[PDB]
Design a protein around this ligand. Sequence first.
Ligand SMILES: CC(=O)N[C@@H]1[C@@H](O)[C@H](O)[C@@H](CO)O[C@H]1O
Length: 156
Amino acid sequence: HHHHHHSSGLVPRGSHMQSYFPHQNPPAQKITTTIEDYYQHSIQNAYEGIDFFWGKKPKKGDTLEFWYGRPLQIKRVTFRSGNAEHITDQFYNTVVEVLPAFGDNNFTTILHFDEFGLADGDVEEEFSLVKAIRLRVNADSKYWVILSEIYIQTPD
Ligand SMILES: CC(=O)N[C@@H]1[C@@H](O)[C@H](O)[C@@H](CO)O[C@H]1O
């Protein structure tokens, strides 16, 4: 019988900097997460360019997955965590992994969230034609989590 901590008593923001960086990403067949979202800041909204994702504390084993209906060619991946209003709310101890369309029937790590809370890089050619992209959390966090940018950049 846990006591819900009410947070919809709204306050002036601490920072006036941009909270979210939308992109048109390739259409996903399925988007899943095991992380509870907050204040309707859904992972689908973040992927689809509507608003930032805000999740509760990640736990070891949590995933956020983007599945594609046909092999998808990707050039770069960016997941930007935290934002200026919530610099603590990063993905810690989390990988970005891809499931290649052909070549490996399991996910392979392509990026880590760095000391800025950013997982960003060019995708090597062997991982560039994908079935799915996901985040996988390797440890419990003390903090909630924000994704302020998701950009799955194609080579076109
Ligand atoms: C609405 C809000 O302030 N959400 C925060 C979150 O940013 C933070 O990481 C978490 C744990 O300290 O506590 C929540 O209340």
